[PDB]
Symmetry: C2
Subunit: 350 residues, 2 copies
């Protein structure tokens, strides 16, 4: 139940320069509804309904979490881009919760790919059919990064079905797996629509952003999700839990490792991009702030529970913490009834 | 510096060979020669075909030299796989080595990459056209999981070369860049997964050991290559980027500190490779061990790395490390030193012309 959480969390928000933006609640609601609306109509189509084996309620919940993530973190991209990216990252989230073994549907993966025949695995059939809607927003380089990261993600989920935290002594396993299913290069590259940035003119800054954003994004997600995990835990295989199993250390030491990487990653993110192309730094900063805001506001992470047990407290953290938490709520706390409607199932049935 | 850290280099190298348990094997020179010729012969006939000759823009002498270095690497490291598998893998890893000879901006040939892939139309970049057309010969040797790893690593490698065309060592302060790039072009998962032919191993029964091997072998393989290459790249003003050189530029440290980092990672990686697999499936441990020993033997025997020079400079020096190094080197030579005239013939160009 550690409270160290707030120390690092505050340091984290300070390190990244967490502060208010020109992104209004009105604007968030506009984007949220637009993104949600296009995605919802997409997943409501009969073909999508047929091949995507997901419980409607879970699909509904996954779509809402994803749309929020995208709209709040990819603050600078067009509405359309937010929408298409929401569809793609909802597909990935849906695969993350699947238990259907991939082996039999991957036996002829390459030959079908090379031949142009539809993939046997239904998820691939849908994701690859839809991919162009995401890729049209980017140059060839960024596109390749999205394609690779998604392919990596697929392998990641395959490995995760084994629920394996690595052999004791296999120090390289934890991060190998985390990067495998982190979508780090997918996220990092999707931050640069060709409509706003020139892939060739900013090749060096984009490549660097992908390399650095990969670890920040996943580590920050691991840090935020830690609360919501040792609490209610079906036996998971998180980066932290794998550090324990593989590196043979205590859950505390593992969490300390994560925080040191997370803070150092943040510090370096600023050091490198502060004095670079201002448009770049803006996208990078908005993603970091948006990404944190999203974690604080989405109930899935139950960070709200942390809020209460600390408001009527008084320290150099719990104080700074709420000051931030409150800030997030002012722009991030939005009732789903204001944007997420009608439900996907309703559009599917119609 | 300007002077090569010979002492430091000798020490780590010895420690390396000890940590991995470097020792003689049942792999005879006669068997190596059999495999070398077989692998080379099939690959040479492949690269000698007109289509291959047309789309693969490479200087004949360089193609010839790259094929010979690769065949050696495969035959000596993938000791336990079939001759055919050694052959097909030799073709694949020769393709990858050759792509580093291209200066051509991939950008224009990648604009429609995904749509051509999804539609089943031949890729615009000629390298992809050849590699994807040939891939099935490599993939037929593996299960779906290992295959996916090979496909991903090769795609990663392509992006790696693209990035290397910029000759960029990373922005000072970008600590994550170096290894990001090294894994990008390391073929770590390609190598790691190609070690398990479905004919010898069950992808499903050994899923956990294979996945672990891929995760661990990725870093061992690339770091060991960086260390063995350190000598040849030391005074080479042409090779501006490398893991060590990028550590220097990105982490803002000295070439020495950078080399220290590499050695600590290399040794720790080795130590952990043994700790994890020693008591696991014996067939697995054997493939893993043979790859490590083979891989080191190959580095010591291939002139490309010019390690012979370091040997011939401490050949007779009564210090501990030096003698151990020379002993190890002599061991390698006994099974690894083979004249190309015994297996690499006729030249690819000759088969191409015919």
């Amino acid at each position: 139940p550690t409270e160290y959480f707030l120390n690092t969390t505050v340091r984290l928000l300070e390190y990244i320069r967490y502060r208010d933006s020109n992104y209004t609640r009105e604007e968030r609601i506009e984007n949220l509804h637009y993104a949600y609306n296009k995605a919802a109509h997409h997943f409501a189509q009969p073909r999508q309904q047929q091949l995507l084996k997901v419980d409607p309620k879970r699909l509904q919940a996954s779509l809402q979490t994803i749309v929020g993530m995208v709209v709040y973190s990819w603050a600078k991209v067009s509405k359309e881009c937010m929408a298409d990216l929401s569809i793609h990252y909802t597909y990935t989230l849906v695969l993350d919760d699947s238990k259907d073994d991939p082996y039999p549907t991957m036996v002829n993966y390459f030959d079908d790919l090379q031949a142009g025949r539809e993939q046997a695995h239904p998820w691939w059939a849908l994701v690859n059919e839809h991919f162009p809607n995401v890729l049209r927003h980017f140059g060839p380089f960024c596109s390749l990064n999205l394609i690779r990261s998604t392919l990596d993600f697929f392998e990641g989920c395959w490995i995760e079905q084994y629920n394996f935290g690595g052999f004791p002594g296999s120090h390289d396993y934890p991060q190998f797996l985390r990067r495998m299913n982190g979508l780090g290069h997918c996220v990092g590259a999707s931050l640069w629509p060709k409509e706003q940035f020139n892939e060739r003119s900013l090749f060096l800054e984009i490549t660097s952003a992908i390399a650095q954003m990969e670890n920040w994004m996943v580590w920050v997600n691991d840090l935020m999700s830690f609360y919501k995990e040792f609490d209610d835990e079906r036996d998971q295989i998180s980066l932290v839990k794998n550090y324990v199993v593989s590196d043979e250390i205590s859950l505390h030491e593992a969490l300390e490792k994560l925080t040191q990487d997370t803070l150092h990653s943040s510090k370096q993110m600023v050091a490198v991009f502060s004095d670079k192309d201002p448009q770049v730094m803006d996208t990078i900063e908005c993603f970091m702030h948006g990404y944190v805001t999203w974690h604080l506001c989405d109930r899935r992470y139950r960070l709200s529970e942390i809020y209460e047990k600390v408001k009527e407290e008084k320290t150099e953290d719990a104080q700074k913490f709420c000051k931030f938490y409150e800030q997030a709520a002012n722009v991030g706390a939005v009732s789903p009834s204001e944007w997420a409607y009608p439900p996907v199932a309703q559009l599917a049935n119609v």
